[PDB]
């Protein structure tokens, strides 16, 4: 019941002995209590805020109604006076320092009974969306639901699933090794999502740990370190085998650093990209090589419509995940499996699901989430959710699309395995 649920969340917040626990409690403290050095110590070292906090506080008093810790990400649902609800969102770095802290109007998602509930909840005028849900079988895929799976859409960090398949293909060939050392240079540093950019120049990291962060933290710097080591040609030549319908859509296969620098840097360089063919684009990227000028404050305008993102259809996503499941099964060391299952993006019912793979991607005007879920008998399902728009405010921070995923998965007995 509502009272039971709120009490359960309050108690769990209090009890949560973890990085998210400590951070969520401290943040709630900012809100419910009556010191800029204590603040500096709780946030990332590269992290106005007192003004922000005064405004948050003005909306209370707050009551905790739900608490959803999920590794380095957490959400707390709050009620304020007169039944108005908000969500406090936390994203942490690898040692539990706060990277992102927001307090925003509540994201409302109903419990789902039918796939039409999903569609009618999700639809937003001005936003293109797509929902694709399948059951994998020896004899092909059973379609459970489909809206526009055939439309190629931008998918942000979903591209890292192809980068991982490319990496595994080369490990199998023996051209790269899991314990091989990669080195962070100023030129290889990208923007968040991720934590590896916060490492010193010259930092030495294994391929294994870099690939782990590339997937589990969607580490952009991690991804770029891997893409650099493999080479753009090796990444691109792999796309056909890894499951992509039209590899020319992702050529040249961009790094995250390239998407950031091209998308929100020099407008003229960006016009030249639009004008150019594949040769001219490769030449433009080569000249753009160097230390980033673009910062996170620069982002906002949409550029995916210019090809400055990573485009694939829903079928492409199913194929790459199924390919990863096969790749993992071949890897007797369990290295691939550990990387893929580190971060499921949600609290999972582990008694139901033996393995869950997950990947999110986002850019201005772009949001996507995908899961592969396999039960203890061996039956696999894949869920692919995508949104694109010409205005970022139509999409928002992604809690909506992720929460729709969560509700589908919560109702798996109705929607996936009925």
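Sequence proposed for the structure above (418 residues):
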């Amino acid at each position: 019941t509502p009272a039971e649920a709120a009490l359960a969340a309050q108690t769990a917040l209090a009890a949560d002995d973890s990085p998210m626990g400590d951070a969520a409690r401290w943040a709630m403290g900012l809100l419910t209590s009556s010191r800029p050095e204590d603040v500096a110590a709780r946030f990332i070292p590269t992290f106005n805020f007192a003004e922000t906090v005064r405004e948050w506080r003005s909306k209370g008093p707050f009551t905790v109604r739900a608490y959803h810790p999920v590794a380095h990400k957490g959400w707390v649902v709050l009620s304020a006076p007169a039944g108005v609800r908000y969500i406090l969102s936390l994203t942490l770095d690898s040692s539990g320092l706060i990277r992102i802290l927001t307090l925003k109007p509540e994201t409302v998602i109903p419990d789902m009974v039918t796939w039409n509930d999903v569609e009618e909840t999700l639809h937003t005028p001005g936003v293109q969306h797509s929902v694709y849900a399948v059951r994998l079988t020896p004899d092909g895929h059973e379609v459970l639901h489909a809206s526009a799976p055939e439309r190629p859409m931008p998918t942000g960090a979903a591209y890292k699933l192809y980068l991982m398949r490319a990496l595994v293909a080369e490990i199998e060939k023996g051209t790269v090794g899991w314990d091989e050392i990669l080195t962070l240079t100023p030129e290889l540093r990208s923007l968040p999502t991720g934590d590896m950019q916060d490492l010193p120049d010259g930092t030495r990291v294994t391929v294994r740990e870099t690939a782990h962060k590339m997937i589990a933290l969607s580490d952009n710097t991690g991804a770029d370190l891997v893409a650099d080591r493999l080479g753009r040609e090796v990444v691109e030549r792999s796309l056909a085998a890894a499951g992509h319908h039209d590899p020319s859509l992702m050529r040249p296969f961009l790094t995250s650093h390239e998407v950031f620098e091209l998308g929100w840097g020099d407008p003229e360089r960006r016009a030249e990209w639009v004008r150019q063919d594949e040769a001219g684009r490769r030449e433009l990227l080569e000249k753009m090589a160097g230390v980033m000028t673009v910062r996170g404050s620069d982002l906002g305008a949409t550029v995916h419509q210019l090809g400055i993102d990573w485009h694939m259809d829903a079928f492409d996503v199913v194929r790459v995940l199924e390919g990863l499941l096969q790749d993992s099964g071949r890897d007797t060391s369990g290295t691939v499996e550990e990387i893929l299952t580190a971060y499921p993006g949600l609290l999972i019912d582990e008694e139901r699901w033996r393995r869950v793979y997950f990947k999110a991607g986002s850019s201005p005007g772009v949001m996507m989430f995908c899961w592969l879920l396999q039960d203890h008998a061996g039956i696999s399902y894949v869920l692919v959710l995508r949104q694109s728009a010409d205005e970022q405010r139509l999409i928002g921070d992604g809690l909506f699309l992720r929460g729709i995923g969560a509700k589908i998965i919560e109702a798996e007995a109705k929607l996936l395995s009925s």
